Every structure is written in C-alpha cells, then in structure tokens.
C-alpha cells in the first residue's frame, strides 16, 4: 500500500491520504513547512502558448484538486455577456447567435478590466474600465462573378460565412490607449459564428465583461484543466521470450520496452501509460505484474482557451486559493 | 470588516470551545477539502470535516473538534494560516521552475 494507489482488475484501493497525525501511534506527518517546503517538487514537462504539462510532486490530493477546481471555475476571464442586435436577418435566432458569440473566447488579458458592479443603474454600470465592446457588421451579397457551377457558397456569394474574426474591437475612451498595443481579438478567429445567404445581414455589438467559470462556462479560461496520478508498473517476476511481447502489447506502445540480450520485459516509460488494466485480464501475468498509481504525484495538463497562458492560469489558481484562505483568516468570526 | 462571511454556529458549539461548527458563505468543496486536510494535519484536532448542506445555497459548515489543549477557533485559524503557507511554497516552487526551465 503506502502511498501507492492499488490498481486491481475489479477495484481501486488506497485512494486516501493517510498522512496526518492520528493515523497511527506514531503521530507523524503533522503539518510543518520546511518539511513540505523540502519535499514538494515541481517538474514542468512542457510549456506552450496554449498548453502546459507540469508535475506537482509530494502535494496532497485535496490541494491539487483545489487548484484544478479554481482553474476550471474560479479564475476570471472576459467573455461577451450582452449582445445588442441592431439587425439579425440571418436564419440563426438572435438568442442562438448571442450564445455562440458568448462562447467565442476573446484574447483580452484580464487584470486590465474591472469587475462589473451590479448594484448600479444600467446607464452607469458599463464603463471603459468595465467592458469591452465588440461589433459585428456582416452583410451577404451574391457574388456576380461566381464561376460556372460553383456550388461552394464562398465563391457563389460574398460574406456567406460569419467568423469570430468578423467581430471588431470598439475601443471606448481609455481603451483606445490601454488596448492600443493589444486590440481585443477572438483567440479562435475561424469559429463559424453564422452562415448567411444573399439578402441576410447581421449587425450587433457585444459587451464583454469579466466573469467566473462557475457562473457561466463561457468565462472558464481553460479548454481543460486536469491532472492524473503518475502510473506505476511493477514487474514482480521476470517476463521474457514471447510472454514478454504479449506483456508489451497490453500497454501503449512506448510504455514498456524489450531488453536486448536480457530479453526480459522492463518498464520504459510509465508516464506514457493509460491505465487500462489490459494486462490484468490475462491470468498469465497475474503473479508477475502489479499496477499502481502514485497518490501524491500529479501530472497537470492545462490547456488555455486563449486569453492567458496556462502557467498564468495555474499561478492565478494558487493565488486564488491563498487569497480566499487569507480573507477567511482576516474575517472575524460572528456568533 | 466582513461579519457575514464566517459565523460560529452556537447550537453546535460545546462549552469551553474545543468543538464548533463554522458556517462559511460563498465557499464550496475547493476551500472545504483543503482546509479539512490542513486542519487534520494538526495534532490537536480529533475531528475535522465540512458539509455543504444544500447545493442551492452557497454555504459551508465545517466541524472542528479538538482535545482539551486548544479550541476549535484556534485550530481553524491555524489551518487557514497553514494553507496560506502551503500556497506560498507552491507559488515559490512554480515561479522558480517557470523562470528556470
């Protein structure tokens, strides 16, 4: 047992932490930094402009899951909230178009907007520190030079497909200077917002405000933020010859390797392993292999929607956890 | 001075502390489970645990019971501070690794 999550053919064992005083007579594992500070490790496997893969090692499941939950549902992001239709003559209903525009992610960095206060009148609620205004003005006209038998609407008609790029930033007051170097643009500009035929027009502007993923999914800044426990494969007895190849076929191709000369099977990369327990259904490696998962080794994969970098999302999550802890500590307890 | 954030539930509180239920508004499993883990890593705590009484209410009742040494309020403050220190350590390690790479 002992920090390894047991992966069996019918059940999962040892999913709880058991690292607190009161678990045993030896009242060890009592909280102290300079012990967590020395044990804890961060290993960044990769870092991209939209995806981050990093390892949180020797941290608790509760803390790692707090980070994941905050990333998904508590890190703020800017999304369209109110869409004002001047004219929607297309076939898509206005409410559907508004939903799609809200689902479009904007490449506007937060901390450059202020949270909207709803305790104020609509005519004073939206400010320049508060809102991003994006306009969409697209009108479909039949292309007169359409090639013979050009069924494709792209050549048959002009502006027959509305894209997220068609949304244009309308700088308001300071926005003109604050967003001069970074004009608000859709993170994904090829999103097919709508498809129109000749005579159909779409004219709208959208008010994009800060929001919270827990409130509406459009405000969630991660396409997916999640972790997985590091898989552990223990080969208890030597497996060789052709049973070794059969053993190797029970894992993803680069997981375990075949030794040369030794001819035995050995674990080459347990990180590449999806825990499918395919080896646990064969009654010939039953006494030869032990599948597990390190309970406190987390492989975080953060994919940002496009507004911020995944490392910034993760740091914002840990800061949010710290800040709510600090706010609760400073709050006086009422009877 | 936010007096509506965390409340001591007096009906579920013992005499001379050491047992108390705290109601924390606008909190959920995120803070609840991390706080429970940290508080349980306190050698004086004999009982920690939170419940979200109803999904329709942004509410969180966290129950702390200690031995006679300290009080539940003391244990809760210690757990909050220790979570703060934990997040400090995680921030420092992450920033160092992001800088290095």
């Amino acid at each position: 047992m002992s920090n390894i999550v047991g992966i069996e053919y019918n059940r999962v064992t040892n999913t709880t932490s058991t690292d607190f005083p009161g678990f045993s007579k030896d009242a060890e594992n009592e909280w102290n930094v300079e012990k967590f500070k020395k044990d804890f490790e961060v290993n960044i496997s990769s870092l991209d402009a939209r995806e981050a893969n990093f390892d949180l090692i020797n941290i608790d499941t509760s803390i790692a899951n707090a980070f994941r939950r905050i990333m998904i549902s508590e890190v703020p992001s800017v999304a369209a909230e109110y869409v004002y239709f001047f004219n929607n003559t297309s076939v898509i209903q206005d409410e559907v178009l508004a939903h799609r525009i809200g689902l479009v992610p904007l490449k506007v960095d937060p901390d450059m907007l202020t949270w909207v206060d709803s305790n104020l009148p609509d005519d004073e609620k939206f400010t320049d520190e508060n809102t991003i205004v994006l306009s969409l003005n697209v009108k479909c006209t039949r292309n007169p030079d359409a090639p013979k038998g050009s069924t494709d609407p792209k050549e048959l008609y002009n502006n027959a497909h509305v894209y997220a790029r068609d949304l244009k930033f309308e700088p308001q007051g300071r926005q003109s200077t604050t967003f001069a170097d970074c004009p608000v643009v859709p993170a994904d500009p090829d999103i097919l917002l709508a498809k129109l035929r000749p005579g159909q027009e779409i004219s709208l502007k959208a008010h994009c405000i800060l929001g919270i993923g827990g409130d509406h999914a459009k405000f969630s800044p991660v396409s997916t933020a999640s972790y997985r426990l590091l898989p552990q494969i223990n080969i208890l007895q030597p497996i060789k010859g052709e049973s070794a190849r059969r053993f190797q076929k029970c894992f993803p191709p680069g997981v375990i390797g075949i030794d040369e000369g030794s001819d035995e099977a050995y674990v080459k990369d347990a990180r590449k392993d999806t825990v499918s327990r395919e080896v646990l259904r064969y009654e010939e490696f039953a006494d030869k292999v032990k599948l597990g998962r390190v309970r406190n080794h987390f492989i975080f994969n953060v994919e940002s929607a496009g507004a911020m970098t995944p490392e910034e999302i993760f740091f914002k999550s840990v800061r949010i956890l710290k800040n709510k802890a600090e706010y609760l500590k400073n709050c006086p307890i009422t009877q | 001075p936010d007096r509506e954030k965390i409340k001591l539930l007096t009906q579920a509180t013992s005499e001379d502390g050491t047992s108390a239920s705290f109601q924390i508004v606008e909190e959920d499993h995120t803070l609840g489970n991390a706080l429970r883990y940290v508080i349980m890593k306190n050698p004086d705590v004999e009982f920690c645990g939170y419940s979200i009484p109803h999904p329709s209410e942004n509410l969180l009742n966290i129950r702390i019971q200690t031995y006679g040494e300290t009080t539940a309020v003391d244990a809760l403050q210690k757990g909050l501070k220790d979570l703060m220190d934990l997040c400090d350590v995680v921030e420092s390690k992450f920033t160092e690794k992001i800088k290095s790479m």
Partner: peptide, 17 residues
C-alpha cells in the same frame, strides 16, 4: 514561454467584486 507575468502585472481581476 518561461517568463513570469504575475510578478510584473497587478492582478486586478482577482479582487472580490
């Protein structure tokens, strides 16, 4: 990548509305 953005930038969005 591999550059801090939180140290330089004031996290205004993380304030409580």
């Amino acid at each position: 990548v591999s550059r801090d953005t939180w140290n330089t930038k004031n996290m205004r969005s993380l304030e409580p509305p």
